Amino acid sequence: RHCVICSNQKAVIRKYELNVCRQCFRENAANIGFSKLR
Amino acid sequence: ERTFHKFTYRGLEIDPLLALSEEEFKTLVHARARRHMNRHANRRAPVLLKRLREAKKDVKAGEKPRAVKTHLRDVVITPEMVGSVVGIYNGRQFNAVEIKGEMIGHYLGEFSMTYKPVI
């Protein structure tokens, strides 16, 4: 497909649960409310 | 005229095939051909498709009708305007000598290499 927070279209696009945050990796680009505890 | 072929393609020679239309052709032949013809019906190219008929009208060569090249490897070979010879696309190769009969309902592409296997 294509991405909306980059225009790269490569370095892999997440479209799981209707979000993109893997053309800007979510570890760097957090505050989506996710956490790791386990 | 200046086109020379033999078909015997589902028992049908040169004459019956060009008598039939493209519509009736696809009812006989490949699953592939049906799908391509149906969805390419709107535009197949005006001028490319034209030139294939135009070169037939042209005379003073016994050689097969010479017609403008393609960049398309996706176009079908129709029963009508057959023996119309074009440069089949590749980035090194154009062939006028891989266009012959018994190739109707088959693509124009699947030809002109893409690899040269060595060793």
Partner: protein
């Protein structure tokens, strides 16, 4: 005297077995065609194939093999269907194999692209 005995059907010796369809596959067929077995006038299984022209009536079977379109039986089991230079041919066996192949052995192997050259 018999009761496991060689059989010429393509003029080729093929040994019997104690099951009819399974042995018959060596003659150029397969199990799923031999659901015609029921209509071949010995639908019975667990039977010798030394039983030719006795309890099998071999001539019957050899008609079904050649044309099953004389019979009412479903022609979804045909090996070739609507060939590119002829109509349907009912079966693939013996020399009739080679005929079709050769035509497309020159054409098919021309193809150029990823999978094309692999087939070539």
């Amino acid at each position: 005297e018999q009761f496991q005995h060689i059989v010429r059907l393509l003029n080729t010796n093929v040994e019997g077995k104690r099951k009819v369809p399974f042995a018959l596959r060596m003659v150029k067929g397969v199990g799923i065609r031999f659901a015609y077995m029921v209509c071949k006038k010995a639908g019975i299984d667990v039977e010798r194939r030394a039983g030719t022209l006795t309890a099998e009536e071999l001539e019957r079977i050899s008609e079904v093999i050649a044309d099953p379109a004389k019979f009412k039986i479903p022609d979804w089991f045909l090996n070739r269907q609507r060939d590119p230079k002829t109509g349907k041919t009912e079966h693939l066996t013996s020399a009739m194999v080679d005929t079709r192949l050769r035509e497309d052995l020159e054409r098919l192997r021309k193809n150029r692209v990823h999978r094309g050259v692999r087939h070539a």
